[PDB]
UniProtKB/Swiss-Prot annotation, chain A:
Function per UniProt: Motor protein that may participate in process critical to neuronal development and function such as cell migration, neurite outgrowth and vesicular transport.
Lineage of the organism: Eukaryota, Metazoa, Chordata, Craniata, Vertebrata
Identification of the protein by name: Unconventional myosin-Ib
Similarity-based family: Belongs to the TRAFAC class myosin-kinesin ATPase superfamily. Myosin family.
Top-rank taxon, per record: Eukaryota
Curated annotation (Swiss-Prot), chain B:
Gene (name only): Myo1b
Name of the protein: Unconventional myosin-Ib
Task of the protein: Motor protein that may participate in process critical to neuronal development and function such as cell migration, neurite outgrowth and vesicular transport.
Glycyl lysine isopeptide (Lys-Gly) (interchain with G-Cter in SUMO1) cross-link, chain position(s): 63
Covalent crosslink: Glycyl lysine isopeptide (Lys-Gly) (interchain with G-Cter in SUMO2): 63
Species, as recorded: Rattus norvegicus
Range covered out of full length: 225 to 370 of 1136
Lineage: Eukaryota, Metazoa, Chordata, Craniata, Vertebrata
Family: Belongs to the TRAFAC class myosin-kinesin ATPase superfamily. Myosin family.
Curated annotation (Swiss-Prot), chains C, D:
Superkingdom as given in the UniProt entry: Eukaryota
Positions carrying ADP-ribosylarginine: 177
Maturation and modification: Oxidation of Met-44 and Met-47 by MICALs (MICAL1, MICAL2 or MICAL3) to form methionine sulfoxide promotes actin filament depolymerization. MICAL1 and MICAL2 produce the (R)-S-oxide form. The (R)-S-oxide form is reverted by MSRB1 and MSRB2, which promotes actin repolymerization.
Its job: Actins are highly conserved proteins that are involved in various types of cell motility and are ubiquitously expressed in all eukaryotic cells.
GO biological process, one term: actin filament polymerization
Swiss-Prot/TrEMBL keywords: Acetylation, ADP-ribosylation, ATP-binding, Cytoplasm, Cytoskeleton, Hydrolase, Methylation, Muscle protein, Nucleotide-binding, Oxidation
Residue numbers bearing the Methionine (R)-sulfoxide modification: 44, 47
Sites bearing Tele-methylhistidine, chain numbering: 73
Name of protein: Actin, alpha skeletal muscle
SUBUNIT field: Polymerization of globular actin (G-actin) leads to a structural filament (F-actin) in the form of a two-stranded helix. Each actin can bind to 4 others. Interacts with alpha-actinin. Identified in a complex composed of ACTA1, COBL, GSN and TMSB4X. Interacts with TTID. Interacts (via its C-terminus) with USP25.
Similarity-based family: Belongs to the actin family.
The species this protein was found in: Oryctolagus cuniculus (Rabbit)
UniProt region (Interaction with alpha-actinin), positions on chain: 110-123, 358-370
């Protein structure tokens, strides 16, 4: 049916701006777990294009799931 | 960590209690559940340091400044929370403190630190929290699947 | 190559080719726009000497080359050399096939028509790009500025130009173009270094003087107070080690070199200066726009990376503007790339994807298609 | 929307749309009746630029728009633009559905027939109102005046008109209509500001001159005494800061601008003036009415918000009227809305509810139904 969406806060909740120096900053952690979480944080390789926005991340995840379900019954 | 649920930005007093469910028994249910599926004993505490960090990031807030003229700088109002997270996560405080308000544009060989405003400081903080918790969650799934 | 077919942005403005993919925060290829050709005989047999060296390699081998900028004052003058610059841009630095990526070229406003027409002809006919779009460079600087309202100057290597924009609407009757930029400041610095006693006349030595300009020059706030300060003592006198030799020691030339950008009578160019063409570009707009221009004066391109040019700019414009106006000179440290960065932001827009000039309609209409679909 | 189905009153007179619900003491929506359309190219991609901006939004974005009043001298001239004004009135400012509320439109007396006919056609056919009623505007000003006996002038933005009424009975042979109002005073103020040295010719600058007229102009009592007073010294000279810039300083233009309303030969209009059309509107009535008109001279509309227009009005009419008459110029501070407020009082009457022009009888008779049931 005709679902009513309230537009209050769509832009604030699509913004996934995490950039280079945050992954570098947590890559330089003495905690080896957080450094193990962020392999993109090395400055010895360039940080490429950022996966923003979060809606494109969720579209990418649903697209991954649909590449999963298509080869199955 | 403090213990009152009004003391955190990501929580409130109005959500502290499901009427029939207590959190401590489910917490011990989880820490009993992690022993079967291969999570070691310092490992779970190392994950709870990360969940502690994701809880503690939200108490950081930002204010603008007058120099420079454009683009306008944001700064941390008080760095008690920054000191507790930077001691907690074992990070030098100048690294993360510079990492809230600036970002390095790095060209072919040249890099520079530029200002973020107040709102984009809140977006970098929010994105740091939920990206940290998200990649923690995916790492837990990989660790189970190992 | 590239994992995706993401569009290319190739800012080739007048003196420094910088290019990359859309969605990036910084260009992946930055190299000077030079073509060096050897002027001496090759006496060592079987070494591997080339016919012409392009860009950074010509900057390395410059001791035995002559250096020719194929583009001057924003106008391409050697199309075969510029074809070498683009061939080196896609195939050597980026290492990508241009047949799979749309390209976003930048020009200066008030340019020749055959510039954008023949640039379109070389993009579609020689390199076979699927789609292209030539856009005004300061508009792109306002994209990376994060604003839809403001007056912009970039000051590349060959051209500075003010574009005032209000609420997304261009004001093309108030666009100022001044052909005074970093290459002219390099030549004037060659003249005043010849005044001190250091004779640079070679094109390689011209690049040395360009490095002196980039490393030691700064914009004074009061030119007579800094002038009498340097006349007083050796307080601001700074030394520079030349490539492969001796140490020079330059004094007032540090601020006489970019003061030509504010006083174009130093190089003998009758104009108003960068602050007064900015102010006249504001005053040629409608009246209820003007304060929003003063609060969003954007200085976000190339040559304006001097120390103290924002303070001098706000001093001169605040002296020109009436009182009770808020003059705000937006000068980020993201300069010298923000014209490219707004190229990436413009290429990454969803609604922009109908505004590309593709094949088939270039192939229908010919090289005047940019004068249909570009601004 | 609205909790009730209370009737709407939409006073759209000539230059300032003000509307609301019945039973209110003040209109909930007041915005200028302008339609601004962009005259420059949109160069920023994906901003959210519109085709045309209406009302207060067009007043904000006026630096990049051209402003067109869809109604001039009380006569609607652009019906599609006026459809945008009404669409913005019900749906954007009031945020209500017009299919559930009766509407009370206002016109000027001695108007074209196709004005009220086509206005009726757009109210029933485009917006689908259940009932409408078009009424003469100065009669409504006498409703908010609290009187059933008096002569009324309102002076909107496009038309001033005297309606004399005695004991509830209209005197339509003595209705005066003078097409001299605030927009003409704005144009004459543009001319005499051009005389001083300030050149305003743009429609946005026309709105600036309108703001100068509203903020700094006043009606002199003796035009030659105030004229020689301003010729004597700088006593009455007042300064105004322009939008986004410099400060102007205006002198005798403060009282030469509204004196055109008393002397229409300034703008070259052969007529008698507002005081002499008021007096002639009194003298064209029957004799035993006249003193009750003089004791209830109502000046309760738009343009007449100048300082000192009631003293000048009582001076001129008292000079024209015979002695032993009590001339009383009713000029409340409830002006500029009292034509609307009496619209609310007329719509809130119980016995008025049979005088609405509904559907089904408009649908029986066609757009001439107003010439059956409206005055
Ligand atoms: N640090 C600097 N300080 C002074 N001048 C500079 C500096 N960096 C670049 N320049 C000058 O600006 C020119 C390049 O301008 P740019 O905006 O990159 O032009 P393009 O449109 O070709 O992208 C250089 O060739 C040089 O003359
Ligand atoms: N304070 C004021 N002093 C002088 N003139 C005014 C003042 N306020 C408004 N006006 C003029 O009166 C006009 C408003 O008249 P109004 O009766 O609202 O028109 P409408 O008939 O459309 O309701 C404006 O266009 C303006 O020129
Ligand atoms: Mg460039
Ligand atoms: Mg009115």
């Amino acid at each position: 049916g005709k679902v009513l969406y309230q537009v209050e806060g769509f832009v604030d909740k699509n913004n996934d701006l995490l950039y280079r120096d945050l992954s570098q900053a947590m890559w330089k952690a003495g905690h080896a777990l957080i450094k193990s979480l962020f392999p993109e944080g090395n400055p010895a390789k360039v940080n490429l294009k950022r996966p923003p926005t979060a809606g494109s991340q969720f579209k990418a995840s649903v697209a991954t799931l649909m590449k999963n379900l298509q080869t199955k019954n | 960590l403090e213990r009152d649920f009004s003391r955190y930005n990501y929580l409130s007093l109005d959500s502290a209690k499901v009427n029939g469910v207590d959190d401590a028994a489910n917490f011990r249910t989880v820490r009993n559940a992690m022993q079967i599926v291969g999570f070691s004993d310092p490992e779970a505490e190392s994950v709870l340091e990360v969940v502690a960090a994701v809880l503690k990031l939200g108490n950081i807030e930002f204010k603008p400044e007058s120099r420079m003229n454009g683009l306008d700088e944001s700064k941390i109002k008080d760095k008690n929370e920054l000191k507790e997270i930077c001691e907690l996560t074992s990070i030098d405080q100048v690294v993360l403190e510079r990492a809230f308000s600036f970002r390095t544009v790095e060209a072919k060989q040249e890099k520079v630190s530029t200002t973020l405003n107040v709102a984009q400081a809140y977006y970098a903080r929010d994105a740091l929290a939920k990206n940290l918790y998200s990649r923690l969650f995916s790492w837990l799934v990989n660790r189970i699947n190992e | 190559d590239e994992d995706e077919t993401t569009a290319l942005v190739c800012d080739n403005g007048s003196g420094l080719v910088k290019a990359g993919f859309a969605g990036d925060d910084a260009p992946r290829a930055v190299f000077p726009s030079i073509v060096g050709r050897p002027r001496h005989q090759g006496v060592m047999v079987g070494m591997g000497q080339k016919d012409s060296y392009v860009g950074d390699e010509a900057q390395s081998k410059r001791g035995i080359l002559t250096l020719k900028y194929p583009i001057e004052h924003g106008i391409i003058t050697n199309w075969d050399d510029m074809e070498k610059i683009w061939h080196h841009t896609f195939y050597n630095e980026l290492r990508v096939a241009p047949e799979e990526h749309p390209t976003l070229l930048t020009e200066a406003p008030l340019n020749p028509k055959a510039n954008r027409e023949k640039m379109t002809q070389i993009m579609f006919e020689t390199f076979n790009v699927p789609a292209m779009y030539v856009a005004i460079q300061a508009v792109l600087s306002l994209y990376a500025s994060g604003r839809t309202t403001g007056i912009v100057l970039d000051s590349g290597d060959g051209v500075t130009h003010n574009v005032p924009i209000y609420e997304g609407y261009a004001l093309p009757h108030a666009i100022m173009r001044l052909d005074l930029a970093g290459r002219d400041l390099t030549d004037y610095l060659m003249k005043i270094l010849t005044e001190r006693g250091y004779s640079f006349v070679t094109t390689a030595e011209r690049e040395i003087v360009r490095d002196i300009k980039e490393k030691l020059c700064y914009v004074a706030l009061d030119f007579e107070n800094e002038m009498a300060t340097a006349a007083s003592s050796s307080s601001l006198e700074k030394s520079y080690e030349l490539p492969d030799g001796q140490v020079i020691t330059i004094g007032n030339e540090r601020f006489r070199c970019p003061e030509t950008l504010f006083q174009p009578s130093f190089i003998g160019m009758e104009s108003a200066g960068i602050h007064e063409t900015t102010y006249n570009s504001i005053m040629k707009c409608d009246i209820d726009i003007r304060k929003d221009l003063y609060a969003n004066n954007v200085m976000s391109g190339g040559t304006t990376m001097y120390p103290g040019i924002a303070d001098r700019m706000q001093k001169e414009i605040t002296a020109l503007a009436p009182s009770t106006m808020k003059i705000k000179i937006i000068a980020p440290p993201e300069r010298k790339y923000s014209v490219w960065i707004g190229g990436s932001i413009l290429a990454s827009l969803s609604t922009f994807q109908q505004m590309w000039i593709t094949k088939q309609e270039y192939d229908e209409a010919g090289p005047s298609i940019v004068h249909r679909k570009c601004f």
